[PDB]
Amino acid sequence: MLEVCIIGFGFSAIPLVRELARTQTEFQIISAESGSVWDRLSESGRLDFSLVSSFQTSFYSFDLVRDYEKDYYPTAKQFYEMHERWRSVYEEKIIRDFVTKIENFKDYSLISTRSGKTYEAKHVVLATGFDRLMNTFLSNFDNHVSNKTFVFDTMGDSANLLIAKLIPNNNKIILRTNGFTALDQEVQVLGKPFTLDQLESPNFRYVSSELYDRLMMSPVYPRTVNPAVSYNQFPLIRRDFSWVDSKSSPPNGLIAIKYWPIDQYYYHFNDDLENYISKGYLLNDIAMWLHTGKVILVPSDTPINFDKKTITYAGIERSFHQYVKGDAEQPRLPTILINGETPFEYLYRDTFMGVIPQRLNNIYFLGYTRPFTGGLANITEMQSLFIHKLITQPQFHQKIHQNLSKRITAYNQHYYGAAKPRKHDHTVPFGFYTEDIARLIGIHYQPNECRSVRDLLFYYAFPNNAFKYRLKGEYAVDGVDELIQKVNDKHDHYAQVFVQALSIRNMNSDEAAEWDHSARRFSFNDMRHKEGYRAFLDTYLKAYRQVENISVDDTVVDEEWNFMVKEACQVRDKVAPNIEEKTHYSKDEDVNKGIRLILSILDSDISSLCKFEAQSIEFIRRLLQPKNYELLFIRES
Ligand SMILES: Cc1cc2nc3c(=O)[nH]c(=O)nc-3n(C[C@H](O)[C@H](O)[C@H](O)COP(=O)(O)OP(=O)(O)OC[C@H]3O[C@@H](n4cnc5c(N)ncnc54)[C@H](O)[C@@H]3O)c2cc1C
Ligand SMILES: N[C@@H](Cc1c[nH]c2ccc(Br)cc12)C(=O)O
């Protein structure tokens, strides 16, 4: 009897196969000869973009311990080459066939394949990925189209990538929108660059869900009246968040687009633009597109005549060249039969942690949970440890399964409340999910075991990447000690993030929203740092066209478009003139002050510790006994 069968080998399965090989657990992989989108993109020479996720959250711990030297955003090519490197290590373990059906019984499954062969296995792991409509569109996109108008009914990372490829050829973009959430993928902290995933300090939720909400959600919800933020200059960007019913913020089910702000793009790539573009580093600053009018937002009910290919807005019947509507990703699951008779219906909220479907036995799903920020690696690495322990330790399997339905019910009450199941339920804050798995497995850290301020910085402020939980214990990886030390030294031990939570501890949500936007450059969608980059943008467009070997006529003035832009930016034109220079910027000052205190007490025992220093030490001491630490779905009762 085959112990483990893994169906699908791309990226999500790598960490599980590593752990199964380590324990010499019998396993067999079955993965299709076709491959993944990355294979198709590679064969067509379309790996010409970059990840929207940081290196430290997008590659696995056992690679980072060898290759991590700085924070950066990998290219699609680098990502695919890592997929291939690991495929080559385990190819001998891969049967190249396509699973068509899985018959599930009480203690084993019967696996059917297109070739006609059948397999039996006690444990079956699905890591088959998702089908996505936009994938084929990106695979067939002619990036030389020029001087055309495009209408988008959906916004997302894939749409934003297409928009980044259309903008340089003088194409005009109309977003027919009911809002979207976009976030600078890299931000300045006291002028220093930080990927957004580095500044989430998720474990502060344990201090207070309200405190963590104040600290995180002002860039998403319209909480500040600051005229420099994009959702006040372009109100059509605001989404209807009436569905949210959980007290855990950021809520499960929230999705965001991560993009290069032009000021950080300039900082990294200005000295070698053509090469960086050719490597896949494309400027996709949606806020800059709105600022310059190259993209406009129009109401969702703006009428479209699909026969005549026109859209009517601002009293203008505007011809358009192409309409783009993305679809919903759907899991690539084969037929699964409960008790070998009843077809299984996949529902994220009816699985535990996105991994254990409670209607099946010894079947696990790997790679179907999506991170709100950061790369999938954080999620699939922790899922792989979870699945590995379930497969190889019967006592853990029983501890989790004995009260499975009760665990799922408690999880859904905590993260979704009374909200009805949504399409995006499978999206989770990565620092909540990794910490949830760590506590289930037992490789978590305990806040009450911190002894020094430095220990508290590590517990609360050091990002909950998967490798954080692989320094000690059951799933320890050699070299993680040096990795953690390097990450700490290059991030000032995450004191700046720790200080943020400290600065807003006594504020309400409105006061926190204003404080988060009181910096000279606040983290997300700061419209004060766009106009100064118009000249660089022209330089960038010239470089992009040279790379793609296209000539574009930028002489013809599109008066019609200028008219539509003026209509679409009426609010911006009323709001932006209210921006005022200030003498002091509270967030910049409070952070600078806090960092000086923390580093002055870094190696001090927590028990040994004007007024700000006194009140801050008091808050720090309470961090040893957080009052919101309970997660009911962790218990076995
Ligand atoms: C355009 C795009 C950009 C992305 N950018 C990022 C990013 O910046 N950062 C990030 O972290 N993630 C990103 N992702 C997500 C993630 O990195 C990829 O989706 C990744 O390919 C998912 O890995 P996987 O192993 O789960 O799926 P896949 O890579 O699709 O692997 C699934 C494999 O299983 C095979 N298979 C499927 N069904 C069967 C079957 N029935 N029988 C046998 N074999 C089967 C498939 O052929 C394939 O080889 C992006 C995804 C897309 C589409
Ligand atoms: N106050 C934090 C907010 C923050 C930092 N990183 C984030 C990622 C997603 C979301 Br939503 C919010 C954040 C900051 O601006 O550094």
Residue numbers in the entry: 1 to 609, 628 to 655
Tell me, in the authors' exact words, what the paper reports.
The flavin-dependent halogenase (FDH) AetF successively brominates tryptophan at C5 and C7 to generate 5,7-dibromotryptophan. About half of the protein forms additional structural elements containing the tryptophan binding site.
The structure of AetF co-crystallized with 5-Br-Trp was phased by the difference Fourier method. In the case of 5-Br-Trp, the position of the Br atom could be unambiguously determined based on the anomalous difference density. The side chain of Gln500, which binds both the amino and the carboxy group of Trp, rearranges and its amide group flips so that it can again form hydrogen bonds to both the amino and carboxy groups of 5-Br-Trp.
